[PDB]
Symmetry: C2
Subunit: 138 residues, 2 copies
């Protein structure tokens, strides 16, 4: 039986700028790097960056909605989002609202998100303002 | 400061076969569904399936190494992999490293993995037998 996410592996086209993005700008902890990868953590999350010459930098309009959201507190959300905008990090657009979120791209065009709130809080919000056709299983 | 992974969103081409795969085959808990998505959990992982007309069923040779690994115990690993094999789930890679991994595809070609073991266990192995160019940060 599955118990959660073991690790997230992102393919990257150039290792050094990606390590710098996740460690220096997003503040994740760097544990190890080698010629073809790096291991970082973000709380409980094990993040692996893997050098892949097949990774292309894709515009957000021609990639699908697959994306990765990181937790941040209400108190830090706005100041962190402002730091990203000031550093020139690019943005993307989702088709729907899902609460307090900031959407941004990594250097290879992976779609990232800062989000405030848990699944339980999301479900409670949706009971009041549901998506079209929403059904709940309790 | 970021405190971990908040949610993982996968773009899907058809909602019903993807719900069947994650809920029934993989055993995740379905919390809600709407006309264009679903919310599931797997342990502490919040998974969102988002219906996206841009999502292509993508062969594994046409996508990069980006992938998502789920936690499982060693005791459960072999029987879970056999279940996937009975259901006809395709494998995209053989495990060639130490530690138990099974690499399988979802119905849209998202690259998934079953893995036994933590980041700390991987770092311990790498300290004994480091990869080419490996540097550690304490
Ligand atoms: Mn999201
Ligand atoms: Mn992996």
């Amino acid at each position: 039986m599955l118990s959660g996410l073991n690790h997230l592996t992102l393919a990257v086209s150039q290792l050094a700028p990606s390590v710098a993005f996740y460690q220096q700008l997003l503040g994740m902890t760097l544990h190890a790097r080698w010629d073809s990868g790096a291991y970082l953590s973000c709380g409980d999350l094990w993040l692996c960056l893997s050098l892949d010459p097949q990774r292309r930098v894709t515009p957000p309009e021609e990639s699908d909605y697959t994306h990765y959201a990181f937790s941040i507190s209400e108190a830090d959300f706005a100041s962190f989002a402002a730091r990203l905008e000031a550093a020139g990090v690019a943005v993307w657009k989702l088709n729907r609202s899902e609460g307090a979120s900031h959407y941004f791209l990594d250097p290879d065009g992976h779609k990232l998100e800062l989000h405030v709130g848990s699944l339980a809080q999301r479900l409670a919000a949706c009971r009041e303002q549901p998506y079209k056709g929403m059904v709940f299983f309790e």
